């Protein structure tokens, strides 16, 4: 069944820690089997629930919370706060939660008066462990002011649905997609945060992102790799549409990566380069919009090159190799060095088709001994 959270005590007045009462409506749903806890307008603050692996809000099988819309209701920490807090709204650790989630609300981490790493969202089973949260779903969802991550969508979720959202001014990335399965990032805005707008990481495979947006970012738009650690290279993954620019680094990143598609999207304004390829193979660059990027040095539009981690977690050395950039209209700015190139570092197999290169000290540049173009 489902709840009103100020039935459980929850006053919303901008002040009252409403944590406890949040939670008991949890709780009632989750034992009705189900269930959508609500909250009026208002602001609700809450306190840390314990150790930072407790989160604040915990939601449990058949639980959703939902609120009178972004912007009108705003769950934030309580000023003062000062502890690591994996998630202010969380599932269970080690425990296989399904059928969860939030919408139209927004989650303010309240960084600038309080201190420690303060995630938006986590959830997930056991990092490096077997099973994982099922069926979760947000839906016009605002996370903004997290000293750390904005949604952190944890190792490891199978069938995720983050729709129609928006995370900006955290502390890390906007986004997270730590090790996710057949999910979803659809319509999503990632902006203002002091990394990546976008971070796809730890082996995640079979995820489609569409029509995301990430501008105004630390570092690049939007990036896929594999991670700190030696594990399974993120895979199979398509970027539909949306538009990546005026980030400090990238606009896309692929790092020790494979059999990644990227179309249809618009990316201008970057620092460095629009789209660049870093160690990774079967990656398919289709239809893209990239321009004037370079803006904060003199790097080409499009940048493919090797990975060296011989001397890393993995001791092998990532050639990018089967590189298919096809059909895209890419143009430089005053410091496009080039529309698209490879370093000569075994970077092997490119295959340039159909492209509109403009306006750049020179169009293409390429070096390994298998790499080829076809009218251009
Ligand atoms: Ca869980
Ligand atoms: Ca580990
Ligand atoms: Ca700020």
């Not at 952190?152 to 997270?176: C, K, M, W, Y």
């Not at 490119?350 to 009218?375: E, F, K, M, R, W």
């Amino acid at each position: 069944m489902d709840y009103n959270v100020k039935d459980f005590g929850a006053l919303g007045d901008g002040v009252s820690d409403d944590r406890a009462s949040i939670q008991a409506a949890i709780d009632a749903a989750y034992a009705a089997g189900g269930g959508t806890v609500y909250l009026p307008a208002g602001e609700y603050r809450v306190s840390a629930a314990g150790e930072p692996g407790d989160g604040c809000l915990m939601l449990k099988d058949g639980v959703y919370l939902a609120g009178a819309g972004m912007g009108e209701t705003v769950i934030k920490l309580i000023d003062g706060s000062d502890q690591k807090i994996t998630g202010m709204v969380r599932s269970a650790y080690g425990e296989e939660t399904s059928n969860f989630g939030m919408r139209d609300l927004t989650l303010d981490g309240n960084r600038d008066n309080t201190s420690g790493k303060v995630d938006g969202w986590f959830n997930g089973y056991i990092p490096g462990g077997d099973g994982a949260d099922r069926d979760v779903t947000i839906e016009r969802v605002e996370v903004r002011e997290m000293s750390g991550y904005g949604f952190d969508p944890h190792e490891q979720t199978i069938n995720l649905t983050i729709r129609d959202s928006v995370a900006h001014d955290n502390g890390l990335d906007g986004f997270v997609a730590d090790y996710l399965v057949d999910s979803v990032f659809e319509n999503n805005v990632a902006y203002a945060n002091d990394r990546h707008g976008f971070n796809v990481v730890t082996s995640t495979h079979d995820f489609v992102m569409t029509n995301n947006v990430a501008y105004g970012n630390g570092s690049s738009g939007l990036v896929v790799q594999r991670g700190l650690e030696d594990l399974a290279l993120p895979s199979n993954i398509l970027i539909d549409g949306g538009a990546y620019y005026d980030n400090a680094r990238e606009g896309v990143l692929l790092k020790m990566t494979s059999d990644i598609t990227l179309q249809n999207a618009d990316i201008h304004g970057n620092g460095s380069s629009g789209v660049r390829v870093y160690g990774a193979q079967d990656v398919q660059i289709l239809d893209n919009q990239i321009h004037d990027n370079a803006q904060a040095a003199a790097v080409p539009e499009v940048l493919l090159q090797s990975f060296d981690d011989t001397a890393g977690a993995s001791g092998t050395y990532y050639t990018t190799l089967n590189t298919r950039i096809e059909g895209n209209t890419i143009s430089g700015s005053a410091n496009s060095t080039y529309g698209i190139q490879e370093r000569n570092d075994g970077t092997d197999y490119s295959s340039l088709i159909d492209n509109d290169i403009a306006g750049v000290q020179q169009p293409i540049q390429l070096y390994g001994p298998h790499s080829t173009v076809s009218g251009e």
